[PDB]
Amino acid sequence: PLRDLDSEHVSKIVRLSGIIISTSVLSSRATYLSIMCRNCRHTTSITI
Amino acid sequence: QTERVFQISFFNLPTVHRIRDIRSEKIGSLLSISGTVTRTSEVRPELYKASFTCDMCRAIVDNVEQSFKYTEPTFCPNPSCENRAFWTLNVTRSRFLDWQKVRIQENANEIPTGSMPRTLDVILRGDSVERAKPGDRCKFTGVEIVVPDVTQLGLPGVKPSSTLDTRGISKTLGVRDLTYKISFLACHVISIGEINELKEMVKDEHIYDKLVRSIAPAVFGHEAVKKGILLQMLGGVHKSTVEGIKLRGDINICVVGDPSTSKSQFLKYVVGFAPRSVYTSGKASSAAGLTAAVVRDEEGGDYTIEAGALMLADNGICCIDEFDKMDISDQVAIHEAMEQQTISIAKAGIHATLNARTSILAAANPVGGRYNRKLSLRGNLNMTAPIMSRFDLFFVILDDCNEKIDTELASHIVDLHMKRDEAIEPPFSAEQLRRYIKYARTFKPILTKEARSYLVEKYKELRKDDASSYRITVRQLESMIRLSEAIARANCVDEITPSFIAEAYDLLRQSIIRVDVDD
Amino acid sequence: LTLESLSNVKANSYSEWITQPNVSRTIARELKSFLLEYTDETGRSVYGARIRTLGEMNSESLEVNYRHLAESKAILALFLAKCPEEMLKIFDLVAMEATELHYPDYARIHSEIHVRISDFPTIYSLRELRESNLSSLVRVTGVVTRRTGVFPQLKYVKFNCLKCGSILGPFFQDSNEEIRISFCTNCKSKGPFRVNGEKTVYRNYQRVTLQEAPGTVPPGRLPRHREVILLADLVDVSKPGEEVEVTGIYKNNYDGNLNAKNGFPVFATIIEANSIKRRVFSWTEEEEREFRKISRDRGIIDKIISSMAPSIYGHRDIKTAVACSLFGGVPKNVNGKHSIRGDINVLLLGDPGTAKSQILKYVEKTAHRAVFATGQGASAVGLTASVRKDPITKEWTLEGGALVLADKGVCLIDEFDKMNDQDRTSIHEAMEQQSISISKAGIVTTLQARCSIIAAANPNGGRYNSTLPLAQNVSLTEPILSRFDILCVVRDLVDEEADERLATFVVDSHVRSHPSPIPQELLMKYIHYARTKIYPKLHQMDMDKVSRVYADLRRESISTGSFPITVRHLESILRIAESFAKMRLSEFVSSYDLDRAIKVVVDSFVDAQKVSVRRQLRRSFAIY
Amino acid sequence: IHESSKFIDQQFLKLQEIPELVPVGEMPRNLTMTCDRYLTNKVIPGTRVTIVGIYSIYNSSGVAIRTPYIKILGIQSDVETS
Numbered sequence A: 001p002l003r004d005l006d007s008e009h010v011s012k013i014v015r016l017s018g019i020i021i022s023t024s025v026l027s028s029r030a031t032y033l034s035i036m037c038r039n040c041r042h043t044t045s046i047t048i
Numbered sequence B: 001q002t003e004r005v006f007q008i009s010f011f012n013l014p015t016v017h018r019i020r021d022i023r024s025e026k027i028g029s030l031l032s033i034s035g036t037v038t039r040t041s042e043v044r045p046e047l048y049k050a051s052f053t054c055d056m057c058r059a060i061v062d063n064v065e066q067s068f069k070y071t072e073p074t075f076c077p078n079p080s081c082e083n084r085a086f087w088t089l090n091v092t093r094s095r096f097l098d099w100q101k102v103r104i105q106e107n108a109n110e111i112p113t114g115s116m117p118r119t120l121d122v123i124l125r126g127d128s129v130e131r132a133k134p135g136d137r138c139k140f141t142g143v144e145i146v147v148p149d150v151t152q153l154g155l156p157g158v159k160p161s162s163t164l165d166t167r168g169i170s171k172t173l174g175v176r177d178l179t180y181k182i183s184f185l186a187c188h189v190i191s192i193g194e195i196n197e198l199k200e201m202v203k204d205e206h207i208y209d210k211l212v213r214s215i216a217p218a219v220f221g222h223e224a225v226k227k228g229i230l231l232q233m234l235g236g237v238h239k240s241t242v243e244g245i246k247l248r249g250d251i252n253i254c255v256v257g258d259p260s261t262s263k264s265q266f267l268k269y270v271v272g273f274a275p276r277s278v279y280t281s282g283k284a285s286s287a288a289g290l291t292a293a294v295v296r297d298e299e300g301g302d303y304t305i306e307a308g309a310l311m312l313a314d315n316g317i318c319c320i321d322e323f324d325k326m327d328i329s330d331q332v333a334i335h336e337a338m339e340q341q342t343i344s345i346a347k348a349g350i351h352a353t354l355n356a357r358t359s360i361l362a363a364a365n366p367v368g369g370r371y372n373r374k375l376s377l378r379g380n381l382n383m384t385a386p387i388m389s390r391f392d393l394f395f396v397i398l399d400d401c402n403e404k405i406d407t408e409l410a411s412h413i414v415d416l417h418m419k420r421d422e423a424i425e426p427p428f429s430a431e432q433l434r435r436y437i438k439y440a441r442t443f444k445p446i447l448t449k450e451a452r453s454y455l456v457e458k459y460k461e462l463r464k465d466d467a468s469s470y471r472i473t474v475r476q477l478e479s480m481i482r483l484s485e486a487i488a489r490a491n492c493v494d495e496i497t498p499s500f501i502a503e504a505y506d507l508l509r510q511s512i513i514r515v516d517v518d519d
Numbered sequence C: 001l002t003l004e005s006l007s008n009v010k011a012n013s014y015s016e017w018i019t020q021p022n023v024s025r026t027i028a029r030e031l032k033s034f035l036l037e038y039t040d041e042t043g044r045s046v047y048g049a050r051i052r053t054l055g056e057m058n059s060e061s062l063e064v065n066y067r068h069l070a071e072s073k074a075i076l077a078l079f080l081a082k083c084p085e086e087m088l089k090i091f092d093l094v095a096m097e098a099t100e101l102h103y104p105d106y107a108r109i110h111s112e113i114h115v116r117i118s119d120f121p122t123i124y125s126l127r128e129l130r131e132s133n134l135s136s137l138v139r140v141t142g143v144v145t146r147r148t149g150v151f152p153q154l155k156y157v158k159f160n161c162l163k164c165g166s167i168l169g170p171f172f173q174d175s176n177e178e179i180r181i182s183f184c185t186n187c188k189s190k191g192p193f194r195v196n197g198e199k200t201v202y203r204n205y206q207r208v209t210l211q212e213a214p215g216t217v218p219p220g221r222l223p224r225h226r227e228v229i230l231l232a233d234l235v236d237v238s239k240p241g242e243e244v245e246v247t248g249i250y251k252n253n254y255d256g257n258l259n260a261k262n263g264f265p266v267f268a269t270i271i272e273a274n275s276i277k278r279r280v281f282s283w284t285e286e287e288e289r290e291f292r293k294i295s296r297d298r299g300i301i302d303k304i305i306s307s308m309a310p311s312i313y314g315h316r317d318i319k320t321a322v323a324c325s326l327f328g329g330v331p332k333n334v335n336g337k338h339s340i341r342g343d344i345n346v347l348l349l350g351d352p353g354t355a356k357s358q359i360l361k362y363v364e365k366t367a368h369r370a371v372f373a374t375g376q377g378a379s380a381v382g383l384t385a386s387v388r389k390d391p392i393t394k395e396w397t398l399e400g401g402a403l404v405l406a407d408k409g410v411c412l413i414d415e416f417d418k419m420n421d422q423d424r425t426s427i428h429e430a431m432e433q434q435s436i437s438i439s440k441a442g443i444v445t446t447l448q449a450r451c452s453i454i455a456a457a458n459p460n461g462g463r464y465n466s467t468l469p470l471a472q473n474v475s476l477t478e479p480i481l482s483r484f485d486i487l488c489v490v491r492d493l494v495d496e497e498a499d500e501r502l503a504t505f506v507v508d509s510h511v512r513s514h515p516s517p518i519p520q521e522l523l524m525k526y527i528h529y530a531r532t533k534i535y536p537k538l539h540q541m542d543m544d545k546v547s548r549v550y551a552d553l554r555r556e557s558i559s560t561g562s563f564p565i566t567v568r569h570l571e572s573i574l575r576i577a578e579s580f581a582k583m584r585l586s587e588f589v590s591s592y593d594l595d596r597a598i599k600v601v602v603d604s605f606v607d608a609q610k611v612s613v614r615r616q617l618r619r620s621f622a623i624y
Numbered sequence D: 001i002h003e004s005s006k007f008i009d010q011q012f013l014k015l016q017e018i019p020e021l022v023p024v025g026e027m028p029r030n031l032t033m034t035c036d037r038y039l040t041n042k043v044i045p046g047t048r049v050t051i052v053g054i055y056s057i058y059n060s061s062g063v064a065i066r067t068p069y070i071k072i073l074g075i076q077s078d079v080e081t082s
């Protein structure tokens, strides 16, 4: 149950039941980034 | 082993100053002032003499005097280190004092024409903390001080400013504002406003009649209300059962009359006599002003409760004029104070249970201006059923046209105007009567075996006679018991006798009136 | 050193005395001696047995008694009073070593043992505390007014070096100020460093607000309050509204920057807890055979009916109805397409001064899941569902009424006749469909409201009118009234003999309060076991009687010209028979139970009728 | 350089305990959950669900306190309101 959560269960897998009351709007997060340096013009990439 | 802090206390000055007469040429001198206390805070520690450690070197500087602000040392004592700004505080090895803040208000009789009351903040230290309660008249002796005030930035006029002199400095910006307000720091707090006579009173065997004839002397007649008010000032007994059921021991009275009757003089008498009493009116009072209100401290970190009429009348009598102009919202709080003796606060995330052990004196106008003798009591009043049930005595004042009574009444009224206060000659004075009431409240009567069986038959007499304007239930039996312990306290004895049961029964039966019917 | 040597302090203060290594070793050895050399009156190893029950449940906390430590070794008691913070670390290491000495490899099943002092002489009220009490052991009373959730606190912290990607080893957190590192041993740097959440071990944390109990506050003054911090096994013990006893340490919050903050230099205080104590329906195989034994005594029904409100005089019919609705029945689903409820509703209609609220109070102390709401008053719970904002956390919450909160239990509505339209709609929905619907703030849902209703109401005017039917004395409507099984009418009839006993009882109460019965404690548990495991049966040999009884009561009702009789009356008959049978922990509904049930419904119908109809019926139905 | 980058979707949800088996007189407690990619827009408020996830913390009065939250790894709905 939701009230039976303690310090033991931290970085561990739990199974929970309940009711949903909120759902926010979808946000954008990056997965692949391409960048450039504003002074010398060096280019590289990033993967998340 | 540390040294003991010493405090000096002066008192008994020649003159006492009013709050509306404080000037700025008396700053930093000794004076005594008067006022009424409204709000108090909890006791917190105060930094007095601190220990600091250097940050360039690690040296220890102890016993730095703070003097109303957070002062830091201005020179490392080592002749080598040249530190003057960088320090750290050892909170483990510093010496503290006790600190409380009190709020005061101007007394009612000292307010000028057309103006509103003034306020002032009082600081207490050491052993003077927790001597002032809310709703008290106290005299303070202390020193008139000034504290910073950033609320004045915006007022018209020239506001003084500070700067450093650049004439004399060799060269090849710190302006501070001088705005202050007047505050007060106290060293002495006092709350202001023989057996031979008491033992003489206890003996006289007409003491009850004299006490009745000493109440509200300015009012003419109306002896039933005078008896009721006395029994309400004396009180009953508070009991508790095995199951935690609480048996109530306060008497609640309601006086019913139209705007013609002299029903507000009774209330004004009680608010002038009794120790802890408050006078409130129906449409000049809000719910927060009756129960309580929550305000936040400037010091930060805590909150404070501010008392209302019901809390300022704890173990006392609350006076309400014009009970019929009360709202349902206020009446649900009054009912909570009457069934329970608690007030519940839930606002802004604060939960608190507060004590309201108070009696209710209330004056109500008939529903249609005048009292209809053909209707029942319920038909003439405008109260919620829960509130009406828990009132003990209902007194109705009706007018009669008799010539001799009119002559007496007119004589009395004119006498008071001609002769000032030499028109009363009461049996007892107010200072005499307070002492007797205080003595009487410390007796705890018990019932006797004759009393039990007399009560049973008196209850069966009431019930058979009621089969009217107000029907008889078990609540009336409990009211009978309460009134019995009230009369026993009036007689200053320790056990109830069947004679007092007769007076209680007669009083209750007389308070009831018969409904008039046509034909 | 020796024990009488320690009692000559040779330092500036107690704190600096206790931290010297030589005095710490001495006190650790002397604590080991206390642990392994105690003996009670008889001589039993008081702490030996506690340390073996430590093994079974595998707990992480140990209870110590200050009286014993004052008995044996007094300087330790003085140091415990003055500087408990330093003492408790030493005392907790000693306990852990002693436990390992009796349970090997317990450092895995648990890594630290906590000491909690049980008794302690001086007890303070919250208003007495002053600045002389700072950093000292205290014991206080109060009432719990607020509670927070469980947050994790750092215990064994691991750091990352963001140049060479290394995990720096366990570092300990003192519960005073946050710890920060400065040196990487592998790459030799003071660069950026961040805590590894995944490899860290945390601790339980919760905060509570304690208020002076209203009763003790001296006249004219207001209650004071303080804050309490609970760590590890102490979280979630005292729910709001209870009275507790706290043993802990009185400290200052080192607020922040004392600079700025113009004004006097004042500080705030907290209490850090060590032990909490309070100042049930679960049963066992010891009491089960006693249940079964009491169940075999003929006439358990009338014992139960007289063990109910054990402080209101007379009113047997209402007590019988209370027992019936406090035991219940069997809900039914016929192949997932037809439902007949199990709970039995009870309405009380009575004149002012007949003790209905007292029975409603009793039901709440006697029951497992019971909730209280008021129609026209001030209560901590309403009847309508809603979405509101939490003052503390600043969050939106879904809250149901007392009907939803009391699922599989009982709901107690006081002053039933003064409801507003909203409460009436909620009540009707709950009683009819047994589920609450809400469409607010994007939430569309249906909730379960399988609850029993008991209600109290006052007639119109104030007194009962016997010359008119029930529907014309009360302000409720037939749709709502028809959803109640049993109706009780309390009439204040002026009878000379009854007043004698009523007044006798009432006066005896006051006289005694001056400054058959089954015990309630067993009844409370019998009620839960019976309603958990007892599902009585309806074998149909006993169908012939009820068919012909219903036929007669239908033929009579139309002839006399009164309320109609519908099959809801027979359904109530059977549902009440279920309860009377379940009273005997039975296995097959008897005919005796059916006959007992029949009286309740027939009496209700007969007594809720006009005077003339009532005289006709009280003679016609004389056989039942 | 935004025209050369790729993105995904992330959502926040709050779960509440069943409003029925709650302590009497206390506000229900709730938890904050995070999900992304192929788990978004799968539920609506008012639904009773089974969630499998990881219990973790993030930093947001007290010496060292952290706020818990759950990373979603599965969703299963008891039954939906048609």
Ligand SMILES: Nc1ncnc2c1ncn2[C@@H]1O[C@H](COP(=O)(O)OP(=O)(O)OP(=O)(O)O)[C@@H](O)[C@H]1O
Binding pocket: B389, B474, B475, C311, C312, C313, C314, C350, C351, C352, C353, C354, C355, C356, C357, C358, C458, C506
């Ligand atoms: N039959 C009775 N036996 C014992 N005590 C009784 C009885 N009838 C009334 N009382 C007592 O009389 C008082 C009645 O108060 P209570 O609020 O319980 O009555 P009520 O009928 O619920 O009130 P009301 O209908 O006026 O709102 C209580 O002290 C109660 O214990």
Ligand SMILES: [Mg+2]
Binding pocket: C356, C357
């Ligand atoms: Mg009631």
Ligand SMILES: [Zn+2]
Binding pocket: A037, A038, A039, A040, A041, A042
């Ligand atoms: Zn570059």
Ligand SMILES: [Zn+2]
Binding pocket: B054, B055, B056, B057, B058, B059, B076, B078, B081, B082, B083
């Ligand atoms: Zn220095």
Ligand SMILES: [Zn+2]
Binding pocket: C161, C162, C163, C164, C165, C166, C184, C185, C186, C187, C188, C189
């Ligand atoms: Zn490194």
